Design an enzyme around this catalytic site. Structure first.
Site, short mmCIF file in Angstrom:
data_model
loop_
_atom_site.label_atom_id
_atom_site.label_comp_id
_atom_site.label_asym_id
_atom_site.label_seq_id
_atom_site.Cartn_x
_atom_site.Cartn_y
_atom_site.Cartn_z
N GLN A 169 0.82 -1.22 0.00
CA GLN A 169 0.00 0.00 0.00
C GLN A 169 0.85 1.26 0.00
OE1 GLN A 169 -2.15 -2.34 3.30
NE2 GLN A 169 -3.55 -0.70 2.80
N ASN A 191 2.66 -6.69 13.20
CA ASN A 191 2.24 -5.31 13.40
C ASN A 191 2.78 -4.75 14.70
OD1 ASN A 191 0.81 -3.19 12.14
ND2 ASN A 191 -0.95 -4.54 11.79
N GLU A 202 0.84 -3.03 16.74
CA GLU A 202 -0.32 -3.43 17.54
C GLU A 202 -1.37 -4.09 16.65
OE1 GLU A 202 -1.90 -0.31 20.28
OE2 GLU A 202 0.14 0.51 20.11
N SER A 204 -3.20 -1.39 8.94
CA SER A 204 -4.16 -0.99 9.96
C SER A 204 -5.46 -1.79 9.95
CB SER A 204 -4.50 0.49 9.78
OG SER A 204 -5.07 0.71 8.49
N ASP A 216 6.29 4.74 -1.00
CA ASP A 216 7.74 4.85 -1.00
C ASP A 216 8.41 3.74 -1.80
OD1 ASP A 216 8.64 2.52 0.69
OD2 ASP A 216 7.40 3.50 2.19
N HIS A 250 -1.37 1.14 -4.48
CA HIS A 250 -1.78 2.53 -4.38
C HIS A 250 -0.81 3.44 -5.10
CE1 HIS A 250 -4.01 1.47 -0.36
NE2 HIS A 250 -4.63 1.00 -1.42
N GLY A 255 2.42 -4.28 9.09
CA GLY A 255 2.26 -2.84 9.25
C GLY A 255 1.02 -2.26 8.59
#
Ligand SMILES: [Zn+2]
Lengths: 218, 8
Positions: free
Chosen positions: A70, A181, A183, A157, A73, A88, A155
């Protein structure tokens, strides 16, 4: 050996100093995009241990590996991964508004800048996909999901679709699912295996575990 | 599956 599909999000580049892009007005939007492109050219910005471990993983698995990100960079590429699908898009690319051809681009974009693919040069547009727009490489991604033996999300969400649905697709096709992750994600409970902590620690440790189980290096 | 890039 098994086919492995990795999905990454902003969390894996956080330790490299890359912030979420735009958590409108064209000039301000262009300024932000240009600042983020510029950030990627600073010598102090480098892939971190998590990026580097994923390159090691592709080296071990060859064509049985696919990385989908996603992220805008180029840190996966810099780490050594190849054929990275940017669902993306990318900050270090632009697209011709007329032909749709994608071009490498490193400096600022301004309305003065034009394509070199058309009979009469046309304006350049962002290559990144914004909310509401259609993601890239989806046929290839869903084909890969349908064949993956292990699906690893790193990483992410769990808030952004269609990427957040990939774990469900993996499950439907019989892949083992792993979340790495800082969290728990919004869909953390949908994963069969999960480890939490800084990506620069958690990802290399998992990759070692996996490579050893695969009897495929270190 | 598929669809536009969208928040939950
Ligand atoms: Zn053109």
């Amino acid at each position: 050996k098994p086919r492995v599909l990795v999905l990454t999000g902003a969390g894996i580049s956080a330790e490299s100093g890359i912030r979420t892009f735009r958590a409108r007005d064209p000039e301000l939007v262009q300024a932000f995009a240009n600042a983020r492109r510029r950030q990627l050219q600073q010598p102090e910005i480098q892939p971190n241990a998590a990026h580097l471990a994923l390159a090691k993983l592709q080296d071990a698995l060859g064509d049985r590996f696919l990385l989908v990100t996603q992220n805008l960079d180029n840190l996966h590429e810099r780490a050594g991964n190849t054929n990275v699908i940017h669902m993306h898009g990318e900050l270090l690319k632009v697209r011709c508004s007329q032909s749709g051809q994608v071009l490498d681009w490193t400096g600022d974009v301004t309305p003065e800048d034009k394509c070199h693919c058309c009979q009469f040069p046309a304006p350049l547009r962002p290559h990144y996909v914004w909310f509401g727009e259609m993601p890239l490489g989806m046929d290839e991604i869903y084909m890969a999901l349908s064949m993956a033996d292990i699906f690893i999300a790193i990483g992410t969400s769990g808030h952004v679709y269609p990427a957040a649905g990939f774990v469900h697709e993996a499950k439907l096709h019989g892949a083992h699912t792993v979340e790495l992750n800082l969290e728990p994600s919004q869909v953390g409970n949908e994963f069969a295996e999960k480890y939490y902590g800084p990506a620069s620690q958690v990802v290399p440790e998992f990759v070692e575990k996996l490579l050893k189980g695969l009897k495929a290096g270190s | 599956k598929g669809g536009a890039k969208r928040h939950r």
